[PDB]
Amino acid sequence: TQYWEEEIEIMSREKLQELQLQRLKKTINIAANSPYYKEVFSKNGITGDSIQSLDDIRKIPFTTKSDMRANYPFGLVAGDMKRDGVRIHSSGNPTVIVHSQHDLDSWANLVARCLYMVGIRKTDVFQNSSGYGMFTGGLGFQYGAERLGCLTVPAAAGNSKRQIKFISDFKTTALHAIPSYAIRLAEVFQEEGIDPRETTLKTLVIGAEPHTDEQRRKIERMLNVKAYNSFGMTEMNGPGVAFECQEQNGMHFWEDCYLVEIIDPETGEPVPEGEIGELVLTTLDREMMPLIRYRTRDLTRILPGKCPCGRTHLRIDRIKGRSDDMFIIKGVNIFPMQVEKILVQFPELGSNYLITLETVNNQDEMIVEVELSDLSTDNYIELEKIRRDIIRQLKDEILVTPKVKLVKKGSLPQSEGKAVRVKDLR
Amino acid sequence: GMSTQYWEEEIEIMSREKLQELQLQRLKKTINIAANSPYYKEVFSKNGITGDSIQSLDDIRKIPFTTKSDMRANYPFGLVAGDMKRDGVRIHSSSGTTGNPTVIVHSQHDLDSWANLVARCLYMVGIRKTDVFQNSSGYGMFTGGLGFQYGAERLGCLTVPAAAGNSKRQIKFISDFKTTALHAIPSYAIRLAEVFQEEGIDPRETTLKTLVIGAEPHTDEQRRKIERMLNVKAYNSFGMTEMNGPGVAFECQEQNGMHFWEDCYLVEIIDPETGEPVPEGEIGELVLTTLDREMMPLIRYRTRDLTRILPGKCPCGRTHLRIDRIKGRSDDMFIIKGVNIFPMQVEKILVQFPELGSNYLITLETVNNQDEMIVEVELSDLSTDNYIELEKIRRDIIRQLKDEILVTPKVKLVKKGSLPQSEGKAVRVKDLRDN
């Protein structure tokens, strides 16, 4: 195994904790200068002596998206923005993250660290099909990949024909795409008469949206690549927060730059070790605008045990779904991943699907539209048998009986960005 | 002069004598680097260019011109002189899939040199690290995006990477982030002042102080109109992807000619017909040579831009030559919404549809201060009048053009023989804008 920063990546749990505590104290002292935490810390009796251990963080209230919207745009800016601010990023009212040069360098180093871990080197041709501008994925991977030294191709979002031309003519080896756009690319290669398994592509970086392991394995087969799960959010910089190692089993969270908590969304207490809860994060290397115990609304768990790659930084499971992604139908709580985890195991089905929620008279109804695979199987009796097995397997998982419609390949809508899997018309 | 502040004083006010010895030292190094590229290795052997060929700056005229046609013929890496696998860190590409685009490969040195020139430009017109700099240019493969982004960060501005379009969000950023310096194409700068009034905001009473305008030819009266509408100082910015993008030439606070950074570029003005140097101060074609690029240097590149060198010393005290505003081109290229387009790009899309004829006309107009591109194309009679099917094809034309020329044009399907004709040498472009 090769590391970008070996001394940090394989640091003992004991030394890593002392580093987190040193940086947690510094973060709280910096945050105290912002109008928001000056008031929060004052009202909750948070002083320079309040944090003596990492468990003392639980003395501080959570920071919510609502708290951030209420303090838009610069209520949480702790540093001297006029003197040291170098960038404003965005994601009703948008969320603003203000960065200093230190913050951008720390972020670029984390992205380089992530890319290096999955085997990308300066000899790689890295193409970024993420949107640029206010999108953190754009400039975040651009700076990270340049810090590593890749020959970068700043393709940006859309124009699939141009994307394929760049891969073919510039001999791209590493590609950053949202999982649903990675599938569209394989299809565009075939449309342009190129075998998607015989290109120069070797590594794919996929994140931005929840997706199953089988969806990633489908992408790996279509393009004959190794695809890696990438976790990020604007509040936490963007990309580079958590990332799979070459074991493809859990995403390593960089604990030298983040303090990770998994809380019970109801009680607000830490969940038992290894249980699903809401991911709550604290920045440990941000200076202009630190975030303390930020409630991400993302649900996941901490995967136990040390990893065979030798890294000592904890691993998180793939995101189950966001809290706002959940929908209630006939009194039952359902997540769109529960539907995807069932649909992906059928090889007769495609990758695009849509959940539609409607009211028929006074009763709510759930419709699951899923595209059929290009791989023949055009037999009504056999397809209808599979469709019945889909309703059956859904009913057992989501504990409600949905309507399932098998639709033509490419008939469902395709977004320019993250896929919208639920359309609620109630 | 006395009150003037410089980013790099030793370079910006360097004596003409010292500046010419610096140019000669870098010109020799550039030719030795370029000799490693497949393209210049072949040009230098065919024209007897050796390590002893350049002894003075006038000896550059021993080397033939590099044209866009030569670059397209050597697509994608025929002019790469450095070790791209070991040191290449970025590729910038021009638009299209119909023909061979233009590719510029940069090393870390090249990106640092580029960002220092943009920082130098921004500092000259009074922008400081305390400024809130908003970039309304397109990012991705657009050099205006990453070029101003890196330059403004190098200077230290609080940057707002707004990128292209969404005027209501542009005005929101200016209002909420208290933007003081804005980069926009001149026609978009006018649109933003109109959108401010539509949203009930006085465009003269915002936090804006400095505007950086470029990418498209515009008159001085157009710039002064922008200054009045937004109560700002607006400065002309010259650049092109081949020379990096932004940071090539830029107005000083005198707003009288654009200073060309001669420590990084060797500037020649030639007769577009003969290829000979024009008499000092006359209009000719701008021919440029990179002096600080290492991965892919460009020698005597024919820009096709027509301008002149403005004589006399500048009161700002800078010794780097000034060029007049670009009033035209010696080729068929046109610029709309800050995007460079060739009429052949359009033609290579239109010929793919059998439902269309051979006659077409591109018209450039200004409708309610906004620039618009109209593509009129005659209908082939090897197609019937199925409105629903024709309109479907017309939408596919707009879609395929947008993907190629990177701008959304208006497409009008006209009757066979309805378009005018006067020759085979007929100008497929009719520009009716006040420029």
Ligand SMILES: Nc1ncnc2c1ncn2[C@@H]1O[C@H](COP(=O)(O)O)[C@@H](O)[C@H]1O
């Ligand atoms: N690897 C990933 N898997 C699942 N969801 C993700 C992943 N990366 C990002 N997200 C989601 O995207 C959100 C961040 O969105 P944004 O700030 O717009 O980039 C996160 O809070 C997650 O809900």
Ligand SMILES: Nc1ncnc2c1ncn2[C@@H]1O[C@H](COP(=O)(O)O)[C@@H](O)[C@H]1O
């Ligand atoms: N300040 C300017 N005034 C007029 N035309 C400009 C200006 N800056 C750039 N251009 C035009 O834009 C071309 C370069 O486009 P690009 O390579 O996309 O940056 C030049 O060769 C000019 O024709």
Ligand code: NA
């Ligand atoms: Na490289």
Ligand code: NA
């Ligand atoms: Na600043």
Ligand SMILES: [Zn+2]
């Ligand atoms: Zn691991």
Ligand SMILES: [Zn+2]
């Ligand atoms: Zn001057």
